[PDB]
Amino acid sequence: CSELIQASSRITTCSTETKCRLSGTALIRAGSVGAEACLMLKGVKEDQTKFLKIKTVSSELSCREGQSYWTGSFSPKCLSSRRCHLVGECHVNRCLSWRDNETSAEFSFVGESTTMRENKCFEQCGGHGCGCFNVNPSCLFVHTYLQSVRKEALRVFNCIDWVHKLTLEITDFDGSVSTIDLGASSSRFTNWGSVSLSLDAEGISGSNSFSFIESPGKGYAIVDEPFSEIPRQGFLGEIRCNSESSVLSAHESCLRAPNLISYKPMIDQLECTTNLIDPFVVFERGSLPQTRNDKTFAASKGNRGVQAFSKGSVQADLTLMFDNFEVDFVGAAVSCDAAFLNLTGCYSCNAGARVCLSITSTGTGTLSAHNKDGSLHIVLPSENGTKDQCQILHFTVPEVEEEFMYSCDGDERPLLVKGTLIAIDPFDDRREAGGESTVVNPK
Amino acid sequence: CSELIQASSRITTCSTTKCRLSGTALIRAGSVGAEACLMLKGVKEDQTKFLKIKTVSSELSCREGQSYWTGSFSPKCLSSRRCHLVGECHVNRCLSWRDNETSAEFSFVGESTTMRENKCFEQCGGHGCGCFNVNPSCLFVHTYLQSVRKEALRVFNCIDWVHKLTLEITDFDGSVSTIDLGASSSRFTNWGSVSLSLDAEGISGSNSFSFIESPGKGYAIVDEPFSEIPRQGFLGEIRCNSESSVLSAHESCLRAPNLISYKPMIDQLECTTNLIDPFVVFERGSLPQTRNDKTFAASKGNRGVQAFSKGSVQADLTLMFDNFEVDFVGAAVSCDAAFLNLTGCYSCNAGARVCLSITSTGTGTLSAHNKDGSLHIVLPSENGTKDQCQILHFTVPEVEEEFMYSCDGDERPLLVKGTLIAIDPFDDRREAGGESTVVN
Amino acid sequence: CSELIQASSRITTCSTEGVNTKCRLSGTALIRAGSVGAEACLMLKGVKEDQTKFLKIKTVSSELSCREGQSYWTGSFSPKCLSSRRCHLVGECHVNRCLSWRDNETSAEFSFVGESTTMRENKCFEQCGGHGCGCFNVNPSCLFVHTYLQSVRKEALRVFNCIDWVHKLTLEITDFDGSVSTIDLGASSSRFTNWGSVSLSLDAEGISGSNSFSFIESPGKGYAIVDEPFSEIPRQGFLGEIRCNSESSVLSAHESCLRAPNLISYKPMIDQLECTTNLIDPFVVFERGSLPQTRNDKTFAASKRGVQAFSKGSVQADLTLMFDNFEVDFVGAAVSCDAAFLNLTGCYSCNAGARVCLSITSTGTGTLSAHNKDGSLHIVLPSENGTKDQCQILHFTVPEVEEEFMYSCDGDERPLLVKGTLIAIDPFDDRREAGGESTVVNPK
Ligand SMILES: *[C@@H]1O[C@H](CO[C@H]2O[C@@H](C)[C@@H](O)[C@@H](O)[C@@H]2O)[C@@H](O)[C@H](O)[C@H]1NC(C)=O
Ligand SMILES: *[C@@H]1O[C@H](CO[C@H]2O[C@@H](C)[C@@H](O)[C@@H](O)[C@@H]2O)[C@@H](O)[C@H](O)[C@H]1NC(C)=O
Ligand SMILES: CCC(=O)OC[C@@H](COP(=O)(O)OCC[N+](C)(C)C)OC(=O)CC
Ligand SMILES: CCC(=O)OC[C@@H](COP(=O)(O)OCC[N+](C)(C)C)OC(=O)CC
Ligand SMILES: *[C@@H]1O[C@H](CO)[C@@H](O)[C@H](O)[C@H]1NC(C)=O
Ligand SMILES: *[C@@H]1O[C@H](CO)[C@@H](O)[C@H](O)[C@H]1NC(C)=O
Ligand SMILES: *[C@@H]1O[C@H](CO)[C@@H](O)[C@H](O)[C@H]1NC(C)=O
Ligand SMILES: *[C@@H]1O[C@H](CO)[C@@H](O)[C@H](O)[C@H]1NC(C)=O
Ligand SMILES: *[C@@H]1O[C@H](CO)[C@@H](O)[C@H](O)[C@H]1NC(C)=O
Ligand SMILES: *[C@@H]1O[C@H](CO)[C@@H](O)[C@H](O)[C@H]1NC(C)=O
């Protein structure tokens, strides 16, 4: 039992059209995941007692997605062919006037594709030193196309709506147990009265913008940066498509930021390169579950989308109404014993460090702990028995040694969170790909 | 009537010693249109007094921060190629050319206060390129920018979101007044006081955003963080401090580096830009736009933007009644709800609009949820039949989703079904510019 | 006294485990935090005995502590280079050698430079040939370039984001003694006192708004806010386009530092060469956002370390009070205050905003609340017995501000005119050009 009640009152409710019903009313807080109000009720005018438990099972924010695109890993492949001045297409203005969608006759053997591709021409040296009788600039013709490095894609998306669901477990007067789902300003009729989410203060808060990646059949990941609305070089989605299949085939309908392919002309040699963000590196770094500002992001039931779970404290008021019954008393909290187990993770990182505790109690409650200056907060569930419970904290030193005071009933006792965390070196998701061209013999 | 009451108590208050006994009711705002019906009993006397409190709207006002003007810019250039050892084309000059130096090739060009730059690109020499001298020739270029359209756009961020909760209060005699309350504010009435005692209204979510004003044509949202300095490939890569400066493409405007591209072709030359079209950005996000159940729209008078909570509202009101306490409260009445239509897109920021036919016998709130609770609908119910709409976000083209609804708490099914359109991946970059005017 | 009472009743609490049956009867009071300086004055009466005692509860501060995530060091860097042009067929200037040059290949032209652990790169640019460029052969000459970076100033800056914002509500509680104690509450927390317990039963405090931001630490010189999202990797045109894992690595421009592609521009001029950078000046960024800074009524300041967000006006939290064997008898009434507009200093259309100051005359401790006509501007400031000045940040969009406020501490509002002149802040570019002409090496 948890101490959850904030207020208790009697209310008369009349049906205007004219019957009147008298109800006892209790304003309780959800408190935290696992918290449970134990209520014994007394009849208002009659001498009867009833029993009722209301338990906070979970607090979830469902991500309703907005804009979405597919991306992946890409790499360039080059065809090259240099002609002397006055040979082939290498006359006067042609090379310098070349268009990205004009294919040189040097590459006629190439059939038409539906692939992301471009064409270039670079003036090179002339004269004997470059195998030409003519001294004017020779023409290095280049045809390039993109290919998927691996035959799998990633779907990147933003979250526009975070829809709250507060799941409650209610043990009614008859002892029957039901699950009640409540949204914002929602009220549910029960056989003993009603229960309503009368004030909801749950929501995504903080100073960071973020988005998510779906890896088909391999889960989700968080991107700790704002969603990129258009293709931009140096950003995730600098190459993007409208389908999973178009990423795999590097289809021409994909969008890409300007100038993503580099060229290094070397007379008869030529390197075509890219320096793209590796989205799979991004995915592995932010692989769910991830916790940010006490919100745990993970895949929903059936891997349909992402959700933010509260695993500890919950900020929601619940108004209970009991027909013809009012509060006699509430169940008292019981103490719990907590022992530090381990601390694992990194410091100065978004993911943070995982602290695990062993919790022993004789009833369902909530462990609440804090460091001295109150900069750190631990909130974990307790029950009749002994379970390990973990959560994420964020530190900024390698050698952590911080004392906490904890309790489930208000009688605080010391607990030392001690461990070694690792550093994460500054990183760069860009990876060079590509290389020398395939040299075509002159025709 | 709505069941909004959370707590009821009898509180005595003492000044300094005069003491006043007031009935005290803690009610939830609930949602827009929700109305608390309170019959009071004389604490001292033997009178019954009726009182109604209705939530009319809940607005967050955007107090703006940094702001700039921008537009749709385009390049126009002059070019002139000279042979080596001719004119300025000597030794080091072309490779050493500075952006702010106008070539003597364009000595006929007057003074300017427009954004401009200058380049010199070496080109082929020798007989094949019309020069006796075999050394590299010099293609000089003078480029300035201009505004395509004769209109500009002001981009800005929002630093403060200031809450206003507007209440409609019905006195004992049936007199109706309107009260506005901000955070932690109270207001005296002729029957006591109403105060916003706990406010959980605010802008929450996983996205940062900004806004654009189009003078006399309304506002738009920008579903991306405000760009603090000029950056290539972002809105405001070119920006000015005024509207008039955008139209003249004045030299005081800022530019990110290297926004103008050059393609020298011996005697031909193209100067091009590939800039974000802010007008396209504007049209995509033109208000009203709804994000995380916040409806963003122009404030009345068309003076800045506001966020309206058109459905659910999270705020506690504390009511005090002088010498009166709560006798009873009006019961909620049930309503009938039927699906009307569903219009919009899927996997898009704007979302889709759902409309319901709602019939009831009194003022109240309709609440709905799909099976897994990932979708939520909150809409006002009234006596009679009225249409009500709200924005939802989906990720499939064919929607078929059963909702359970109630106004009184007794749930009934309802089917939201319709077809949503796709929005293809887009790029706001638009190519502009072209060939130069060739001198001589 | 403040009017903070929201509910009041008796609650009986009992052990239900079957061991020790101890039922305690408590009075219970649900109060709003209201704002900084808000103080509930509670006269309690005995529940089992004929006794009275006075109790006060005052909201002292509401702090959100930044638990940092990813972090990096940066600074202002500058390019320095050596250049040496060789004619075609001379030295390394053969076939396609110049066009094939790799960033990490030092030219033989610069064999004299010692071992280096500094950020550096090498280039080769083809230049003119023939007798006009001092060469016998007409194929392109080779301008070889070796470039290294250096830090201008001997300072560095640490840029970081905030992942967690841990709330702490501090209260001053005056017992029946007159004795005052300070208590700290986190979310859904309870603290026992000698008269019962106080618990933060509903917490509506948090970082809200439409902007993402991060922070900069200047070692021994405070912090700053950056009104833009943290950049996770080096990107040209952004803070952190060059970043390091330590302060000293910034100062030495160490090779372990990361940088975005092509941050060094080159201007080949036959035997002259300019190597330049146009990097974001992080010290300019720091100065613009120097703490304290107020955003959406949140005052960001140093912890005194790390950064915190203070709610100095309104505070949105409910507190649940339990009194052992005591219940609420009555509460102290709020008092009127009179406000006088002092001054208004700052800028318009800017993230920093403008600071308004009032002089608030009252007869007791409370809270002043005000609003302009359309309710787009809100003012919440602490009130005290006497005449005292108080200030807060507002945000405007005009150089000449004219706003009429209706203020109150009890509920009956009176007019108040706010009038001032705010400066404009022109659009800015944090980029600064650096570097210049190469040191020209003589051939060997
Ligand atoms: C609490 O559970 C008691 C039995 O649970 C036992 O389970 C074991 C796994 C181990 O944890 C033992 O220490 C436990 O005692 C049961 O006998 C009690 O009745 C329960 N207590 C309450 C208050 O329900
Ligand atoms: C409540 O509604 C009653 C019925 O509404 C009428 O108006 C029509 C528009 C349509 O809804 C029909 O059902 C009805 O003829 C009306 O008679 C009552 O006066 C209304 N009462 C109040 C208090 O609004
Ligand atoms: C028949 C004479 C001859 O063979 O000399 C060369 C040709 C032009 O050569 P090309 O462009 O056909 O192929 C060059 C091979 N490569 C790429 C290895 C350099 O004639 C000229 O010198 C220019 C007219
Ligand atoms: C008298 C020397 C002469 O006139 O011919 C020049 C030399 C090559 O010159 P270099 O590369 O050794 O140095 C010149 C210094 N510079 C480029 C900075 C001006 O010979 C050739 O052209 C090919 C053998
Ligand atoms: C290339 O694009 C241009 C338009 O920019 C078009 O006119 C031309 O036909 C295209 N060429 C080919 C081969 O598709
Ligand atoms: C830490 O403790 C938890 C809880 O039992 C356990 O699951 C986990 O494996 C432990 N990790 C390490 C590294 O010991
Ligand atoms: C252009 O900029 C240079 C900077 O070196 C300056 O000396 C010069 O006065 C400016 N104006 C002109 C017309 O060159
Ligand atoms: C959907 O129904 C609403 C309410 O009647 C109406 O205003 C709107 O025009 C309808 N939409 C379409 C596309 O018919
Ligand atoms: C330069 O870097 C390449 C990889 O890009 C490496 O293979 C090569 O060994 C490096 N050369 C030197 C001299 O460090
Ligand atoms: C404005 O008044 C405050 C209150 O005393 C004072 O601290 C500040 O210096 C004043 N500033 C100006 C510019 O008058």
Structure description:
3 copies of one chain form a homotrimer. Chain A is mainly beta and 443 residues long. The first copy, chain A, has 3 domains: 1-65 and 158-209 and 289-331, no CATH class; 66-157 and 210-288, no CATH class; 332-423, Immunoglobulin-like (Sandwich). The first copy, chain A, is built from 2 helices and 31 strands. Chains in contact: A-B, A-C, B-C. Strand 1 (5-14) of chain B pairs parallel with strand 22 of chain C. The structure holds a molecule of 2 linked components (NAG-FUL) (2 copies), the ligand CCC(=O)OC[C@@H](COP(=O)(O)OCC[N+](C)(C)C)OC(=O)CC (2 copies) and 2-acetamido-2-deoxy-beta-D-glucopyranose (NAG) (6 copies). One ligand 43Y is lined by residues 82-84, 86-87, 131-134, 268, 442 of chain A. Chain B: It is found in: Host Golgi apparatus membrane; Host endoplasmic reticulum membrane; Virion membrane.
Q: Structural class of the secondary elements of chain A?
A: mainly beta
Oligomer type: homotrimer
Domain module count of chain A: 3
Please outline the major beta sheet of chain A. Answer: 10 strands, antiparallel
Number of helices of chain A: 2
Shape of chain A: elongated
Strand content of chain A: over 45%
Distance between the first and last residues' Cα of chain A? 87 Å
Q: Bin the helical content of chain A.
A: under 10%
Largest interface: A-B, 81 and 86 residues
| Bound heterogens, unique | a molecule of 2 linked components (NAG-FUL), the ligand CCC(=O)OC[C@@H](COP(=O)(O)OCC[N+](C)(C)C)OC(=O)CC, 2-acetamido-2-deoxy-beta-D-glucopyranose
**Radius of gyration of chain A from CA coordinates:** 32 Å
